[PDB]
Ligand binder design. Structure first.
Ligand SMILES: CN(C)C(=O)c1cc2cccc(F)c2o1
Ligand SMILES: CN(C)C(=O)c1cc2cccc(F)c2o1
Lengths: 268, 269
């Protein structure tokens, strides 16, 4: 991969692998989410930020500050098949004192057609106390020289799906998958649960008949709290409708919320 | 990737990804196992066999016959770091009427040094009845034109670890991880549990202190029976031993039916 001509975005190509595809012989949404993370990491390395998933500066590191995902929104028009080459372009933008945004555009390398798009909201947090904080001028100016100055949005449309408020699922849930636990393959280099595992956990409570007859078109996920390595999760889903679902991940014992989200599925 | 000059082996390069590494910032053994699987699949595609993990012929497909892994053996000398380029060469050999063998050699692309090696034994099974069978001349002859004629072994040594008999762990196990269940990401295109998930499950019962102070050098895993999508597994481990060795057993959570057995060898960091 490489930074583009103006140095304000990064592109990379990936060939879809045999173990990365589902029953349709096309990439799963978790494979897509892993590729989004990989290209984000390579963009951070290319300009000198940390390469641990937190994309921090030396100033943030001394203060024990990190960037954490608050929301992920992905829309796929066509999932790439096994052996296909997908090109992904990514860029970031500061969103004032609130935090930052990372956007992505996925294209079929052969046709040049846009096959997907994604956006994510990130907030600054002290890694020890877990307390959020606004972004100061000093940290903001370190990032601004690597971002487009004029707004560039993967989801420009007014009142689009990426910015909608997600309600809390009410008990009883229509469907559930209980007792979900991470294994070492679900952890990152810092022993934290990888963000993509939560997408997988949300999808576990979708009935297999839906997965067999529909394709996932849109997923919006809010991240409220981390699942620790020794935590156990319950995945809950209720149909709200194309088929739409409301989702909730919570700790198996006390019922503490870790994530909430929505999915939109199209009949095959 | 591509078939080599003589057409009897296949090579492919991979760059280690950010989400593919563990706490050491180097590729996990499950990332290595996935890469071995990917290069095996690309080798099968290159010569016309099926690309579903079973590497079958048209004759096998009509008879509902598939190849399934009976044993996997991996030895890693150096795990590649994030951003490193690893080159993997793979080839197959028929092992008479018993089945076939697939071998791999992993190299550091920059230095050319061998950083790992692996071997796997495959048997022919009817997909529906799950009954094993010997390999007939007709099936054997279809594969032989794509294999070296003279023996070529990733593990040539006379008393090598890849062919040792594995005993059955006796209760009580020293360590355990109970209630392990596959999720959709653990399944292949045919909705079967991916072979690499079992490696992950075996490793779940190794204490975290061992993982934090040692590096996995060798893993030998026997595959006895499949874990279905709605099955639940228990992973059991007992120390058998600057080197630590363990004996492993995966079995169904309820009736205790064995699905896998294996051994691991770890060296102090
Ligand atoms: C969540 N954060 C802070 C990031 O991922 C991030 C921001 C950014 C700006 C310019 C260039 C980059 F590579 C950037 O990475
Ligand atoms: C487990 N099996 C049967 C295989 O993976 C296999 C055997 C083989 C022989 C020549 C060339 C190939 F590509 C081969 O693939």
């Amino acid at each position: 991969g490489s930074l583009t001509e103006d140095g304000l975005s990064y592109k990379e190509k990936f060939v879809v692998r045999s173990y990365e595809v589902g029953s349709n012989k096309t990439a799963t949404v978790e494979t897509i989410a892993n590729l989004l993370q990989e290209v984000g990491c390579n963009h951070a390395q290319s300009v000198g930020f940390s390469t641990d998933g937190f994309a921090t500066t030396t100033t943030m590191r001394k203060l024990h500050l990190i960037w954490v995902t608050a929301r992920m929104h992905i829309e796929i028009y066509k999932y790439p098949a096994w052996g296909d080459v997908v090109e992904i372009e990514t860029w970031c933008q500061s969103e004032g004192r609130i935090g930052t945004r990372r956007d992505w555009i996925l294209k079929d390398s052969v046709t040049g057609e846009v096959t997907g798009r994604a956006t994510s909201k990130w907030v600054m947090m002290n890694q020890d106390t877990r307390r959020l904080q606004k972004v100061s001028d000093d940290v903001r100016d370190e990032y601004l020289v690597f971002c487009p100055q004029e707004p560039r949005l993967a989801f420009p449309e007014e009142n689009n799906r990426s910015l909608k408020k997600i309600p809390k699922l009410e008990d009883p849930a229509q469907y559930s998958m209980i007792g979900l636990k991470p294994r070492r393959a679900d952890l990152d280099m810092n022993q934290h649960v990888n963000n993509v595992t939560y997408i997988g956990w949300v999808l576990e409570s979708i009935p297999q008949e839906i997965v067999d007859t529909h394709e996932l078109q849109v997923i919006t996920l809010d991240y409220r709290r981390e699942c620790q390595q020794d935590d156990v999760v319950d995945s809950l889903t209720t149909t709200t409708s194309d088929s739409q679902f409301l989702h909730l991940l919570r700790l198996s014992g006390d019922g503490q919320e870790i994530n909430r989200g929505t999915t939109l599925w199209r009949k095959k």
